[PDB]
Design a protein around this ligand. Sequence first.
Ligand code: SF4
Ligand code: F3S
Ligand SMILES: [Cl-]
Ligand SMILES: [Cl-]
Ligand SMILES: [Cl-]
Ligand SMILES: [Mg+2]
Lengths: 599, 269
Amino acid sequence: AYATQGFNLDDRGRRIVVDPVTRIEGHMRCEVNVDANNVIRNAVSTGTMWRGLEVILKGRDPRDAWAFVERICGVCTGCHALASVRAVENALDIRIPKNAHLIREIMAKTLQVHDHAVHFYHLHALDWVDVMSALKADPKRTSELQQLVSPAHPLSSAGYFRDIQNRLKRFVESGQLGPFMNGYWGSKAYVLPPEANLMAVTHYLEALDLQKEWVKIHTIFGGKNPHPNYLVGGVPCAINLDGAASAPVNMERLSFVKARIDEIIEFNKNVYVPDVLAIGTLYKQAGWLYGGGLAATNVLDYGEYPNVAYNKSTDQLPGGAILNGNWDEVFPVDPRDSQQVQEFVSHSWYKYADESVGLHPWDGVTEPNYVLGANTKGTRTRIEQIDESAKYSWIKSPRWRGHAMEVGPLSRYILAYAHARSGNKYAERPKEQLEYSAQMINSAIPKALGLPETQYTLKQLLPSTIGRTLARALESQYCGEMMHSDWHDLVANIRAGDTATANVDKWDPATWPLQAKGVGTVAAPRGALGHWIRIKDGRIENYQCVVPTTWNGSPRDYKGQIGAFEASLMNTPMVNPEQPVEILRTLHSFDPCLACSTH
Amino acid sequence: PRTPVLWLHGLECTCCSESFIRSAHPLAKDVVLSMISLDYDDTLMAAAGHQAEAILEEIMTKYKGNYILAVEGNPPLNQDGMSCIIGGRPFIEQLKYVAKDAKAIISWGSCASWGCVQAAKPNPTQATPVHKVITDKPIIKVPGCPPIAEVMTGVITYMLTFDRIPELDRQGRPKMFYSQRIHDKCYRRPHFDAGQFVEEWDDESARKGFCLYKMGCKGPTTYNACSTTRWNEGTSFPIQSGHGCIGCSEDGFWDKGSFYDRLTGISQF
Ligand code: SF4
Ligand code: F3S
Ligand SMILES: [Cl-]
Ligand SMILES: [Cl-]
Ligand SMILES: [Cl-]
Ligand SMILES: [Mg+2]
């Protein structure tokens, strides 16, 4: 047992194992220890997969890299391609044309919306929503709840909810529960009334049908989803309005994109955000404000979406680092600085010459070393209880100037709030969303549901599993609003006569410097993404990825500091230590992508 | 009663699972609620840990020789198999256990079919396709990174309607979706036939939709439904949106040279 970052870690209590962690991307094992009152007093995050993309890339052409690294992950599909082309362009001093910038931003914001909304409904919702309780709901009361939660959502009739309920009833009465089989239904950890559960299940089905429309934006610009195509120097989707039906992008295609964006705006505003505000209100009322972990102290993002291309002071999700819960001081984050972003492997299944130091990714090393500690229960190929005192994960340990940080939408929203309070005008919208959300959660929704009004500040509400879930929904909404503006800027630029989509001046490697290094960063759906590349004689010399779930899911560092997942689980009571409802609820609030984390 | 599907995940990126839920005809919602019983799937299932693993036992017993095993991703043979761990054990052990009583095995995507990106040189985990590990069961390969959504649901729909695997080619792919090369019906083919090619990105030729062969298009050597069925309810495909096919449904496509290097012997095609 030891203390770190204000957490008193203690492994003497009852050990609980969750393997597999489900409703995530990829493979994770989680172990906790609980005290005599079922409160988590130790948590262990184990990434249970590795593929070795960084190793595979060595010797290949930098122009091909985006497609390899895109296949790090099909959920956050394209964000790695974006990081890669940015890294190569940075190495080779390539400036992309305005239309390519705007198209990439539209693609990025489409991914944010799709990823966030699908995560919440299809992966996260079942930690908050009891589907069996939905069967007991009254359709008229569900209709009335829907009208209170979101007046503008037109799918609100009692008959509609009754039809959805009857279909769920028939499914369940078949005896083949499928994805609902052996669930934790009826646990006291679930607090929603039946009507709220039926509303949420209805929206789960609505989101499942609608999500396939949103990604058609990727299909137009990138050919396919998942895994749209990218290009070093711009985009491949050449523009021709008249000369034209044969060009990748004409006015009809752009009109189609705008129709899809408009639908997204409606979904975020009428379905997703109101649902999260409502569910968050009801769990707040139950007192479930656990899960803050590192969000209460240390948050980081690289900053993204500049109002003016290549001008970072105009980032609409402005970044930096906050330490020790001091929201009055945002430190600048420089991905080029060797003393800032570093990765340790002290408790990871890799080898460095000296594991007491962290490597900046331009000097990163990925040599596997699968070995289990002396206190392991089980064998090398049959683990019963992992030994977190030794190496226990395929995830490296990223730190910022040695500090353990949380990344993600919550981090970006805390940073945006801090920036806005310091006078940054580019952060006004996320600040407004937060203030609106706090008022809804504290007063308006409680007043509408006949519950007591509360007075939580953003300082109190945001660093919590509820807050983390809320920030994701708000970010989805903001991203939809931003790409709506980007579309207008794109069409205006094309109509003014600039149709350029690629800079090919340095396409041929005979034009390249004989060596170069570059970095590309992205505000990916789950947080701060970076790719660092070294090029030599036209080939990849080194390629290192530090990915958002690498930060959040990281195991302990050389100093024994815990990462965001482990910190978030600490000090949480479990209704039943053998039903991982609370573990799943909090882990899922980070939207863990394990293929991303390990690559 | 709906046929149980046990959908396992090895080393993967999850693109095939995501592609599956893009299906418009049929809707994935209707597949899950009314066509199959999706009883195990790490991506979507409510149960975790011990409760999740208990499902495999139950379904294999009750539906012995009458469930479908779908596999996304692949097993690693290096690191003693523990570069992919499930329930504290190598994934390959789960794969072999569930495969033994399956009536049919679907290898979803290039990972399960052939190896895909993790099997590209130097293959640090010795990632191995399903058919090299499971050698005594009927397998259908549905390659592509990911496969087209309607190809995935088209395969499931066939298997459920007929209780049969559709006719396969020599490589184990369904002829109903993989009989044509992209180049056969690619809408840019008249340009190829007239020697009309893009030579640099965003040149005049690119703005007129000229053929992408000289920019590295692997359509002439790649079998898939992308030129006809197309992607995301027939919205586009890679070539329509201006990038050459990179060959993503073909075995070993990551190690066939740069995606931007053209095929040699253009007269072959
Ligand atoms: S080479 Fe590619 S772009 Fe050209 S006709 Fe063939 S498949 Fe179409
Ligand atoms: S890259 Fe793949 S998606 Fe189709 S067009 Fe080529 S087989
Ligand atoms: Cl290395
Ligand atoms: Cl209060
Ligand atoms: Cl392959
Ligand atoms: Mg890395």
